[PDB]
Amino acid sequence: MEHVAFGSEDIENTLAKMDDGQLDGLAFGAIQLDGDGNILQYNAAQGDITGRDPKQVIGKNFFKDVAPCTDSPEFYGKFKEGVASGNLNTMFEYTFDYQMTPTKVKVHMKKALSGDSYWVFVKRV
Numbered sequence: 001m002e003h004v005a006f007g008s009e010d011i012e013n014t015l016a017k018m019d020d021g022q023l024d025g026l027a028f029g030a031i032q033l034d035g036d037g038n039i040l041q042y043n044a045a046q047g048d049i050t051g052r053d054p055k056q057v058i059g060k061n062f063f064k065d066v067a068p069c070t071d072s073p074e075f076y077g078k079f080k081e082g083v084a085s086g087n088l089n090t091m092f093e094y095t096f097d098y099q100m101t102p103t104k105v106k107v108h109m110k111k112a113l114s115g116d117s118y119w120v121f122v123k124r125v
């Protein structure tokens with residue numbers, strides 16, 4: 001259980017040191033996306049919430065393949081804008097409802113410290 005609070009101001013610095021195994025000890029859902037939306041990391045808390053098997057979604061496109069419910073200006077559009085601008089820090093509520101019971105969550109999207117990588121953090125509300 002890695003002690004990092006959701007929405008922490010310096011979360012990108014703290015998560016810079018975690019490998020896939022340490023990511024699995026977070027109290028919340030954590031997805032790392034590349035600039036095109038491909039999933040690079042996907043932790044255990046996130047699979048708990050979504051029912052996805054983390055090893056099976058690495059490599060897949062989040063917006064096209066795994067989470068089409070996020071393919072809308074309200075989620076993907078903010079993502080695309082941040083990638084385009086090279087800056088991203090936003091939090092909002094969303095409902096996850098593809099192939100699963102509709103689940104309301106808090107989403108925090110933030111640019112990683114490292115290269116062209118972007119974090120998506122999720123927790124139940």
Ligand SMILES: *C(=O)/C=C\c1ccc(O)cc1
Binds near residue numbers: 050051066068097099
């Ligand atoms: C909408 O599609 C939100 C996200 C999401 C992620 C994974 C799975 O399996 C369903 C939905």
